[PDB]
Amino acid sequence: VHHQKLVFFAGDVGSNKGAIIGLMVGGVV
Amino acid sequence: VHHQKLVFFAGDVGSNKGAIIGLMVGGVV
Amino acid sequence: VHHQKLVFFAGDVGSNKGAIIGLMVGGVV
Amino acid sequence: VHHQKLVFFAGDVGSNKGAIIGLMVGGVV
Amino acid sequence: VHHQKLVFFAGDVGSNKGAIIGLMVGGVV
Amino acid sequence: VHHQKLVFFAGDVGSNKGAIIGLMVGGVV
Amino acid sequence: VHHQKLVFFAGDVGSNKGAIIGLMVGGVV
Amino acid sequence: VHHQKLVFFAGDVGSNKGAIIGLMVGGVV
Amino acid sequence: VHHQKLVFFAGDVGSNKGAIIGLMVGGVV
Amino acid sequence: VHHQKLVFFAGDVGSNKGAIIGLMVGGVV
Numbered sequence: 001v002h003h004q005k006l007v008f009f010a011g012d013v014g015s016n017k018g019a020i021i022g023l024m025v026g027g028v029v
Numbered sequence: 030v031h032h033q034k035l036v037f038f039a040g041d042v043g044s045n046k047g048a049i050i051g052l053m054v055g056g057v058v
Numbered sequence: 059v060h061h062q063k064l065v066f067f068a069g070d071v072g073s074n075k076g077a078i079i080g081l082m083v084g085g086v087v
Numbered sequence: 088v089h090h091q092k093l094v095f096f097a098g099d100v101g102s103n104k105g106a107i108i109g110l111m112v113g114g115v116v
Numbered sequence: 117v118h119h120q121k122l123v124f125f126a127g128d129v130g131s132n133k134g135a136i137i138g139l140m141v142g143g144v145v
Numbered sequence: 146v147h148h149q150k151l152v153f154f155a156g157d158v159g160s161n162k163g164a165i166i167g168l169m170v171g172g173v174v
Numbered sequence: 175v176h177h178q179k180l181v182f183f184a185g186d187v188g189s190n191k192g193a194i195i196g197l198m199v200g201g202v203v
Numbered sequence: 204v205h206h207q208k209l210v211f212f213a214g215d216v217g218s219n220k221g222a223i224i225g226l227m228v229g230g231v232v
Numbered sequence: 233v234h235h236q237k238l239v240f241f242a243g244d245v246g247s248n249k250g251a252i253i254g255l256m257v258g259g260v261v
Numbered sequence: 262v263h264h265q266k267l268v269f270f271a272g273d274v275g276s277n278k279g280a281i282i283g284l285m286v287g288g289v290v
Contacts, residue, residue, distance in 0.1 A: 025246035112159035
């Protein structure tokens, strides 16, 4: 009705369900 | 009705369900 | 009605359900 | 009615249900 | 009705379900 | 002398000198 | 002398001097 | 002398001097 | 002298001096 | 002298000085 707009997000936005590692160092030095 | 707008977020926004590690160091030194 | 707007958040916003670790160091030194 | 706006938050905002650790150090030194 | 538009997102947007590693170093030095 | 081992930590171990914040929510609702 | 081992840590081990934030939510709702 | 081993760490091991953020949500809803 | 080994780390090992962010969501909804 | 080995690391090993981001979502919904 006179320029109406709707946006539907049926799922998650920006979700994490696994692993996020910024830095990983391993050694047997 | 005269430029109406609706936004629906059916899920989580910016949710964490796993693991977030910024830094991980391991050693057997 | 004359430029009305509604926003719906059906889920959590910025929620944590897992683990968030900033720093993790392990050693057998 | 003449530029009305409503925002709905059906869930938690900024909630923690898991573990948040800032720093974690372990050793067998 | 007079230039109406709708956008549907039936799935997740920007979700992670695996592993994201920024940096990974390993050594037997 | 017959399997002698020494470990020296010249600095702090698992210490905080900055800011550690677990959760932060801000709004201008 | 007969399998002697020494380990020297001249710096901090697993220490924080910056900012560690677990979760941050901001809005101008 | 008969299998002697020494390990020297002149710097920090697994330390943070910058910013580590686990999750960040921002909006102008 | 009879299989002697030395390892020298002149710098930081697994340290952060910049920014590590696990997840970021921004919107002008 | 009888199989002597030395390893020298003049710089950082597995360190971050820039930006590491795991996930980023932005929108003008």
